[PDB]
């Protein structure tokens, strides 16, 4: 019993975190094989950040300008190149702790673990979701850029996020490991704002299934709904549309609990229209949307890594 | 900016997780140097659960009865001893991944990260607090026994909890790494119940300071209170009493935000009286009590 926000074990990722210093800027790098990946803004100063020509800035750099430190050992940079918003620093040593890994780009609603780092040292691990507005509501202070988001599949780490910046509202923006930003953001000091966020409906339904699995069942009702009628109500309350794909992914949880997806949707519809009435679900007075259906199945079945 | 429930990076603990099998029971063990620590109930059968005599059961065991597996390698047990409710299995190999570590007994209100494991394999990591009733509200399934709670300060892992069991309400009970249970619990199937849980008041105040640091000010008010008046109100909402120690520990946060402890205390009394009125604090509609003052200063 129990349901917690649970991150993947971070060990395989901790063995890849290094410190990248370029001039006055120190941030984190991800050392995989003989390459160190980090945000390309490490090569910027004050003027550069306002209107940066990164290709021009990187051409003026040499390998010895990049100071890479793995633990207490200095790695020597033997090459540098840029792929979108990420800088790739070729080093003379392959990381002996390189795990089985992939670079994947995730979609909004998907969750991942963040290994927050400062000066190449992991300080914390937390679970979060890629919001529908492509920001993440993380916890990051100055020096955390280069911290990575990941999932673990069998014995394979899928790196899906690298932290780049904090938006004016306190939410965070970053890129996949190929340097492509999630969302309409840019790595430059300019006026940038996250779009109005919406609730991840499929994850709320998965979390209601996790609550039923844990014995919390007051919100269940006799009713069902059509997918279209539910989606009309979802739009009204800034909830993402629920697709047939989402209904199919919730199938195993529906079979396990005996509550059809559209039956759970009628529960959710009433929760939205009437509130919790002083009650809580899994110790929360709000509907939680940062647990995907796979997260609920993984946790409520004990899948290990 | 941002405030999240954050666990410590679990790598230093993952390298210590092993599988301990004794007869039909398989649970987790913590391999540090040449010793594997695990719950002593791994030596229990069906009729040795309501009233087991662990000293008598352990005397009947030999080293060859304990099957320890670290990854795909079988460790050879060369000695066994019991320290309170923990079993210590001396092995013929020191764990090369043994980090700098300490065994620490924590107090209620203190937080720690849990590395949930099954069959000696880490499946997830989450942040917990030792409840005032000495239980933890974890997320554990059958086979999670031996999973450990820890904190990391600098390079050193302080092991503070080993999971032993789930109570009838779904909450969890366990021991420190010297086998001493937290709370009035025993490692047997006898009738046991967690006492009525209360809210960790000092942790709620620390979390309100984290909210002010993050730009949330709506719950602030022009009032202050005496410590005694705050406790008389707080206790009526099943909140732990706030001691002078707690007021002192909140001093740095009070200095940083400019809001005196007793001023924050009056804001908390108001929050208890009115509820949140549709508003949230740090993305939560309830008062969060699993962030200590130390966690807030660290994360902010
Ligand atoms: O956002 C940035 N760093 C941070 C990242 N995460 C949490 C922070 C909390 C507090 C302060 C900084 C934080 C840097 C420095 C500010 O200016 C920029 C600009 Cl203009 C662009 C880019 Cl891509 C990065 C950055
Ligand atoms: O609770 C126990 N294991 C578990 C631990 N954590 C979460 C669980 C969730 C679901 C099922 C089992 C779980 C064991 C087996 C059952 O009975 C006992 C008794 Cl009577 C005493 C002791 Cl010390 C341990 C245990």
């Amino acid at each position: 019993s129990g349901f917690r926000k649970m991150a993947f074990p971070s060990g395989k990722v901790e063995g890849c975190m290094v410190q990248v210093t370029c001039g006055t800027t120190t941030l984190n790098g991800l050392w995989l094989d003989d390459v160190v990946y980090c945000p390309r803004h490490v090569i910027c100063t004050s003027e550069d950040m306002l209107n940066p020509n990164y290709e021009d800035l990187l051409i003026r750099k040499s390998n010895h300008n990049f100071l890479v430190q793995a633990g207490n050992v200095q790695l020597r940079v033997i090459g540098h190149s840029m792929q979108n918003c990420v800088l790739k620093l070729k080093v003379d040593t392959a990381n002996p702790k390189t795990p089985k890994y992939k670079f994947v780009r995730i979609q909004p609603g998907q969750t991942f673990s963040v290994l927050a780092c400062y000066n190449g040292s992991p300080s914390g691990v937390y679970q979060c979701a890629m919001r529908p507005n492509f920001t993440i509501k993380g916890s990051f202070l100055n020096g955390s850029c280069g911290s990575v988001g990941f999932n673990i599949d069998y014995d394979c780490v899928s790196f899906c996020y690298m932290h780049h910046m904090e938006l004016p509202t306190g939410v965070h923006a970053g890129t996949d490991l190929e340097g492509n930003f999630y969302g309409p953001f840019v790595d430059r000091q300019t006026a940038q704002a996250a779009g109005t966020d919406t609730t991840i409906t499929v994850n709320v339904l998965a979390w209601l299934y996790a609550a039923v699995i844990n014995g919390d069942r007051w919100f269940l009702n006799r009713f069902t709904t059509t997918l279209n009628d539910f989606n009309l109500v979802a739009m009204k309350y800034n909830y993402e549309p629920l697709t047939q794909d989402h209904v199919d992914i919730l199938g195993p949880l529906s079979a396990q609990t005996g509550i059809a997806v559209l039956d759970m949707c009628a529960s959710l519809k009433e929760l939205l229209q009437n509130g919790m009435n002083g009650r809580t679900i899994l110790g929360s007075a709000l509907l939680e949307d940062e647990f995907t259906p796979f997260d609920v199945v993984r946790q409520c079945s004990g899948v290990t890594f």
Side-chain angles (χ1 to χ4, degrees), chain A:
Chain A
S1 313
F3 208 68
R4 280 277 182 198
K5 192 148 285 155
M6 187 186 284
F8 282 95
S10 58
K12 285 165 168 60
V13 181
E14 291 167 50
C16 306
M17 305 308 305
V18 301
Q19 186 192 61
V20 179
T21 297
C22 189
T24 208
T25 309
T26 292
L27 43 63
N28 311 280
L30 180 69
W31 187 22
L32 299 168
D33 304 302
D34 59 346
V35 181
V36 168
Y37 302 81
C38 76
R40 79 170 167 180
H41 70 72
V42 68
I43 73 181
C44 296
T45 315
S46 290
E47 168 71 286
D48 312 314
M49 221 60 232
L50 310 175
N51 207 24
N53 188 329
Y54 285 107
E55 174 191 343
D56 176 61
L57 292 171
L58 191 62
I59 273 168
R60 308 175 185 268
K61 295 271 167 178
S62 66
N63 297 326
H64 270 221
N65 291 145
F66 300 99
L67 306 169
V68 178
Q69 197 177 320
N72 259 107
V73 176
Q74 184 186 325
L75 293 178
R76 63 182 298 114
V77 179
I78 66 170
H80 64 257
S81 80
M82 190 179 288
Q83 180 175 15
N84 300 303
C85 298
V86 148
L87 175 67
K88 303 193 284 193
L89 300 175
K90 187 79 141 165
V91 289
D92 81 330
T93 293
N95 187 3
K97 297 181 188 157
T98 305
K100 281 197 59 237
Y101 77 91
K102 290 185 288 196
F103 286 172
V104 309
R105 181 167 177 93
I106 63 164
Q107 297 171 303
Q110 297 199 282
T111 61
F112 57 97
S113 307
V114 172
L115 181 66
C117 302
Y118 298 85
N119 301 298
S121 171
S123 56
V125 58
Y126 58 88
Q127 189 72 357
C128 78
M130 174 60 61
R131 302 304 311 168
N133 72 1
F134 292 103
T135 70
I136 76 161
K137 293 175 164 169
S139 175
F140 292 117
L141 303 162
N142 200 40
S144 63
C145 304
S147 293
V148 302
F150 66 100
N151 286 294
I152 303 174
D153 178 57
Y154 300 82
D155 59 327
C156 180
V157 175
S158 309
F159 291 103
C160 61
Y161 179 85
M162 174 163 278
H163 184 55
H164 284 65
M165 43 158 37
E166 183 174 296
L167 293 174
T169 56
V171 301
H172 302 99
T175 73
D176 56 30
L177 266 290
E178 309 214 289
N180 289 300
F181 260 92
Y182 286 98
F185 308 114
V186 298
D187 53 344
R188 155 170 49 106
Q189 173 59 54
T190 183
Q192 316 192 54
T196 67
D197 203 16
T198 59
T199 302
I200 312 156
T201 313
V202 59
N203 293 1
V204 171
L205 292 165
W207 177 77
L208 292 174
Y209 279 111
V212 171
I213 297 172
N214 276 278
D216 221 339
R217 304 162 177 152
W218 66 262
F219 51 88
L220 299 177
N221 65 29
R222 66 151 71 248
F223 309 111
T224 185
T225 177
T226 66
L227 190 54
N228 198 49
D229 283 357
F230 175 72
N231 276 331
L232 290 180
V233 182
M235 190 186 285
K236 279 186 57 182
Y237 295 81
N238 266 24
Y239 265 62
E240 280 298 300
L242 195 74
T243 67
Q244 189 50 69
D245 282 18
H246 295 145
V247 173
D248 297 342
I249 294 166
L250 294 160
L253 286 174
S254 163
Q256 178 180 359
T257 66
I259 310 271
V261 177
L262 297 174
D263 180 2
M264 194 62 90
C265 288
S267 272
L268 178 54
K269 176 214 311 158
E270 300 303 328
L271 289 181
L272 296 175
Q273 303 170 350
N274 299 262
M276 301 235 197
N277 314 294
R279 281 176 296 211
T280 60
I281 297 166
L282 291 178
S284 174
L286 299 172
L287 300 177
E288 174 65 43
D289 76 348
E290 303 205 341
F291 289 102
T292 71
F294 303 91
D295 293 346
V296 171
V297 164
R298 199 185 287 125
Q299 185 172 173
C300 305
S301 88
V303 171
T304 70
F305 310 94

